[PDB]
Amino acid sequence: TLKDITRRLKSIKNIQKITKSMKMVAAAKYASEQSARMTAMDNASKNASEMIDKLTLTFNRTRQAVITKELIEIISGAAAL
Amino acid sequence: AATGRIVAVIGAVVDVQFDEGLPPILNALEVQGRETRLVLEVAQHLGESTVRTIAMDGTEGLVRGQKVLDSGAPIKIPVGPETLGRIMNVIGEPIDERGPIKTKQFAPIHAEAPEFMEMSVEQEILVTGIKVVDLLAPYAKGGKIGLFGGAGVGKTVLIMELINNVAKAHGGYSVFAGVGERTREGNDLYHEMIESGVINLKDATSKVALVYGQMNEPPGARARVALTGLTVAEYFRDQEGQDVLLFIDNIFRFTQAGSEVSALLGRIPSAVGYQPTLATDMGTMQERITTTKKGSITSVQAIYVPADDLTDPAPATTFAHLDATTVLSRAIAELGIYPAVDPLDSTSRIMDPNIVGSEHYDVARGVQKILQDYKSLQDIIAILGMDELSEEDKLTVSRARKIQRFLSQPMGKLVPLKETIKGFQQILAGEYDHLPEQAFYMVGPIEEAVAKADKLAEEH
Amino acid sequence: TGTAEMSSILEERILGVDLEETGRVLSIGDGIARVHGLRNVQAEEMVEFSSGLKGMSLNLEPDNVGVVVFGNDKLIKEGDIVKRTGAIVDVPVGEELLGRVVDALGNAIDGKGPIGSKTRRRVGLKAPGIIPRISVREPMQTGIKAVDSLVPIGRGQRELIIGDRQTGKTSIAIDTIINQKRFNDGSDEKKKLYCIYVAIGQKRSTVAQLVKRLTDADAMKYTIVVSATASDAAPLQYLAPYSGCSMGEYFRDNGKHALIIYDDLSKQAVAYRQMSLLLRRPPGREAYPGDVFYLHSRLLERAAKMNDAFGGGSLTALPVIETQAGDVSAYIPTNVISITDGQIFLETELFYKGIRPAINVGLSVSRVGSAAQTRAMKQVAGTMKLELAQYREVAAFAQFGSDLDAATQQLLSRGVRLTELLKQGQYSPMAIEEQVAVIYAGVRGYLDKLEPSKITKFENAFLSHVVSQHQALLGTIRADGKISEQSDAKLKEIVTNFLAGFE
Amino acid sequence: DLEETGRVLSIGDGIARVHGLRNVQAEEMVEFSSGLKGMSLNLEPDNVGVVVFGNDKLIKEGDIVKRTGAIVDVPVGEELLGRVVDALGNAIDGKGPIGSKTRRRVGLKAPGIIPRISVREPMQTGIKAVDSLVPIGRGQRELIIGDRQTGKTSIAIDTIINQKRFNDGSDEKKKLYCIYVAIGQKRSTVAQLVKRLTDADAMKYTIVVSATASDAAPLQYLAPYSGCSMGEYFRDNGKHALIIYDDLSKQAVAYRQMSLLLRRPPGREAYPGDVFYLHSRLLERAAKMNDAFGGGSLTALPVIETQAGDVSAYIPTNVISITDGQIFLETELFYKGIRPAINVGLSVSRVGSAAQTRAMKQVAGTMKLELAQYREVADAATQQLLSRGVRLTELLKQGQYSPMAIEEQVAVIYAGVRGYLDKLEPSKITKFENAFLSHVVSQHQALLGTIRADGKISEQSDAKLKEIVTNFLAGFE
Amino acid sequence: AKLVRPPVQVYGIEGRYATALYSAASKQNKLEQVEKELLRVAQILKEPKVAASVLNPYVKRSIKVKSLNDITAKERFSPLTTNLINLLAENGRLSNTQGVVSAFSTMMSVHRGEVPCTVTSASPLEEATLSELKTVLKSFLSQGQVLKLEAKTDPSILGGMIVRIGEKYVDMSVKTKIQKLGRAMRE
């Protein structure tokens, strides 16, 4: 579904923003727990970016399929006349 | 008049072939040889003296060759004060079992919209008493309102709140058009209007006229019943000078019914399968709802949004025909907050400081802004938690939750406009940041909020 | 071009039989017979083919009739003779049908002998208007705690059971049917509910298993089963819900109360779409015809509660809808969601989480609401409802809420307790008194001490105890419909004693 | 005579299949019997598909259709200024007939490549966000795209009102004649808009073409081209024009309906094949003519209504690929207090920097760079970026129906970008802004005068500006 | 009811109506009679007045069938052809009747056993060798058969003959031999 994928994408995007901001502030305060926080938030941000890439692929696939399905509906409806 | 014959009957579409006297489009034809009156509305001329028609009731039992008589005019309904308190269907027959509607005037349901020079600019706000509506997107006299929402968000109950408050606090011969809605809810509304004194079966001082074409009707009936309601309200405005109310519930069915006819009318489908002629037909309908120099028709329209989309062709097309839209959201309805009005999706054209004033306008903008920032901060609280954030940020989250609670309104409440803006200012400035969040839930003004806070604190 | 412009008609027409009450098949294929002649036939009139097969005149066209065939078209050839019968469809109704399994036309298919009813009723009758009805007031007891508590159904309501495949919709309907045994076994006639189960496009083995389940629960002697299975012609699966609705409208019109379950309406919409596409009607969204909303709406609007001046009977509908991958934004789910008075939405995620009946309370709704509840269930269900709403609103942050306020922790704990409270096993529908007893023991605070994994054991033990030792309290709560202050104190006494003696 | 006269053979939902008319031209205006006019869009071997400029209840099978001999044309000229006409040029304001002396076709070809010159002179909108971050030049096509109730018509009306200071001055080549085409609008909304423009004395130089929601689909399809020809008149006669289409989505919907009922093969979302063509050949007529052709111009501000901010829909895609930029308006920024709700990270102006005035160029370069870095970062250096960005975005807000002169905008943005508002905290800037304007308006007419006359901030004017702003910041609450 | 299908089968509304007419006539043996009938009908219709009287889509079907029944009672036409024109007026397929006529002609053209031969040459054909080629083409047939030979000329084919017997086709022209020799020397 297109709207579900869009909602989940926006979710993971704001999560990636938050985790990269936390990586920034942790690398700032680290200048043994701040180091762990910085590396963990780096891991979280890159993992969120991977999930965003995969969900973006699936979103493009789904929106192409949606365009196809609606065009085939319109075409088969026009051909019955 | 002109006599034709039925040649084809496909579902709810009937083709009639006239020897002489071809009837223009939108004319009404009567089918002869039936116990109940079956009206067919002309839609297309197909050549060879054949017209295509949409039936106003079920088409079972029709025979190829059955005689059909031409009315010579569109569907003409009885209009006048004798329609007040009665229930009529799409073709103007009474369906309340009280006898005929003895009026002096008949009006065709297909008429042209008012001109350009007949337009009025006067915009006088109508206060309804509800904090969320009258605060964020308040209603204006003479303008179309619109109440969007999915299935189960509270559109019917909202229109019933409005019926109670407004239609009783008004003196302008309201009209209720039930466009393809549940017969159970229609019977409920009729009976609770009767026992509320708005409808008087004896010594008729009634002030609401009801029009009902319900769900089990064919698509043509549910497409023209809103036009019937419009025609009644147009009489009460034009030839009566009154300021009319028009509660159309639910308008999407109207649009929906349009779709269901176009399929069989031999027309290529548009997006979402809607008809090619959606926008302009809904426009010819919605442009008759307006304030002219003769009178006003302020219309409260409940609009069904399929799957809570709001980008579907029907709601997206309706949005432009409205003056103060208040969208009922499902995500807010699952929170238990009622009414489910979406504060960041309800827009009013009279929410400008030239009409409501700088104080009300500032409260509205501040509430909407703090709710938007609350949703934004919900990101960081969903990742980390509020106990890891700034000072004024969690203070803002607390104030925003308090505002979300105070937007609710149940015993029923009546919160005047100045009292409403006062309460919301007192919450916004933070004057009551010590009172708990659930003291503002399901209360009236700030007084009942602080009182419920006192009580809840006294026990727990 | 031209259906009737075949060379045979043309040559014997230019050259020189009753073509008013009789026609000849021009073309037969895929169950759609085009018939030349039948000039007097009515729309939706039932006609008779030469082979004994029946048909329904669905497309009245200028030069031919598109007839949908009620069977296998191998017995219909071009040139066959088609006669009129002059009548629309009609099915036998009455008390003689209870306990019988019939097909979509009212013919017995259980081999117990022919139906012995005296009255017949049309299947395409109209619904009662605005005036003959009255508000839905009387409770229709399902025996399912989640339904009877949070999604209450009243007599005259139309409650949709919607969900993906294999989530528990048929089980909910069957528990509802089985529950009415306690009312139909009594003598009070205005609490008896006669059930009708319309099986649309299922296996015959599934309907056989269902009839066995109803017989082993002694719930067939007041049930009718209308069976239009998967091998039956699309017209029969199209027509089965209306036959069932007429069988229930007999009970409605005569002062009795009927319940009807369409299982399910997705397959009825599929059969209608097949008939419409083969009749060359212009397809719409997902190839569905333009008047499929009209189909389901005209069907479901016949479930009504009549006022005392019209007998006082009622008909309750429980349509079933199967969604594909949880997508309720489809065509038929959207239509039937907009038509009905609420939906009992079943989840798959919730089903495999041990929450079964897998009712999603956040998405379920009932427009009648507490107006269809007894006073006791109302008293407990209001607080239960608000409690669960708060819990679900704050449960987006569970599994970590122990690092926060006591308020959030207590909301989450009470919510997990209450969700463990609503679980229920199959084929065991509880009487309303026992449901109220459990919800009382749950919501007034008598579960904050038990860790969530033992709430089911407590539920079972507590019901055993209160059915063994407290029959008088349950009987007075049954007679009163409400928890009296004396009965309130007795309930508190019992639950305190039990939680004291509980392990 | 079945060669200049046909007879209606079929009629249905706006489409007349007319038999006869053997000599009619494609897209020619024919006249039915009842008075309604139509356009011959389909010329088929056995009939003509005519789209009716009216209703179907008035024409029925067998009516007569006469031929005009000319393609669809509209009265153009000076006489239309102040007048509200419909899609055919007929007066609907009740002020009498149009005294038009010239007619002009509606489907003309856009000017070629040689007649043009680069877009160099600014079209002043009077809006700070536009004039600073998304500048528009005379000859440009700037899209105004956004969801419902986001402030698009308000941007258009603020532009139309702002042109008043130039239309009352002296230099003829700085005046601008505005045109507002209303497609699918409410008639009430158009009446109230005409009132808004008349109150601000902005009708004496404005033409309003109105194809409201109660008008036939052919009229809504035609109104943009009628307005465009009315503007092409001023463009070709050495004057400067501005034209707003509010909005093009509804014209595309009307055309989709027309073509679907003419049985033309539908495409994506049932739009015809040439629905791109429909808009491109409309938005290509907005051009800037070189001084060998008169030196005129025609600026287009088309409006587009997206659904849930989807700019990859079919019609938004087309009009984004056609125009020279766009101004995105967002609801999420609408409610955060950002008004006009212009999303600046997405708003583009390809030929804008060449249009800005030198002073506004100076201040807006720094403003855009600072907002860019702030949006990119949105300790002891990064929250400096945050603070500057917050103060600037608080400086961008503006009220409705009150457009500012260019020198006032340069003064405000200059107070903002030099760091003078680094002292005041966010919720103060707006206050200062208003007060500051009064100051620079009342006692300091010489500085604004020299900035308007010279077009830039000379170092004398720069020092005067900085001393003014520090003197006002010192004695400000 | 059983139908008699002609040896050639024609398609379209034209073919369907002409097939109906042929299978009606074959049950009563009036084939050349109704051929004469439809010949007269076609020459009746081809005059402009009555043609525009029946080609008008504004004349209502009863009026035009009235004029048609009057004019067919004028010429004492057989009930078969009157019924056929009545059906063409009923189904509205009347304007196309000419094709039907032509169709029926071609149908009976294979009832008497004629085969159409078309001979194209680069030069306007002589008399002697033209009769010679007629005799040669007659040898490719069965008995009871007739040659409908119609020789038109194409001066672009550079020589030889292109003969078309039914749809059998022999290309003895010289341009094709030139093209074939060029293809041979090229591949």
Ligand SMILES: Nc1ncnc2c1ncn2[C@@H]1O[C@H](COP(=O)(O)OP(=O)(O)OP(=O)(O)O)[C@@H](O)[C@H]1O
């Ligand atoms: N409350 C329950 N407790 C335990 N198991 C249940 C419950 N409800 C249903 N089930 C089980 O889930 C399975 C599927 O349930 P069921 O077939 O009744 O629902 P359905 O929606 O009709 O499925 P289908 O798509 O096959 O028709 C069954 O094995 C059933 O026993």
Ligand SMILES: Nc1ncnc2c1ncn2[C@@H]1O[C@H](COP(=O)(O)OP(=O)(O)OP(=O)(O)O)[C@@H](O)[C@H]1O
């Ligand atoms: N800069 C602004 N400041 C304050 N209010 C504004 C501003 N711009 C617009 N508004 C308000 O927002 C509301 C809607 O704006 P507007 O009608 O101009 O945009 P729109 O997209 O054309 O709406 P529609 O969808 O009806 O066409 C108006 O009431 C207007 O007063």
Ligand SMILES: Nc1ncnc2c1ncn2[C@@H]1O[C@H](COP(=O)(O)OP(=O)(O)O)[C@@H](O)[C@H]1O
């Ligand atoms: N005062 C109230 N108390 C409890 N529930 C309410 C109240 N008002 C409305 N509701 C609920 O609002 C929901 C929406 O009802 P309805 O108005 O029919 O929805 P809609 O019109 O949006 O489809 C129903 O479930 C109803 O029970």
Ligand SMILES: [Mg+2]
């Ligand atoms: Mg509703």
Ligand SMILES: [Mg+2]
């Ligand atoms: Mg099942």
Ligand SMILES: [Mg+2]
């Ligand atoms: Mg606008």
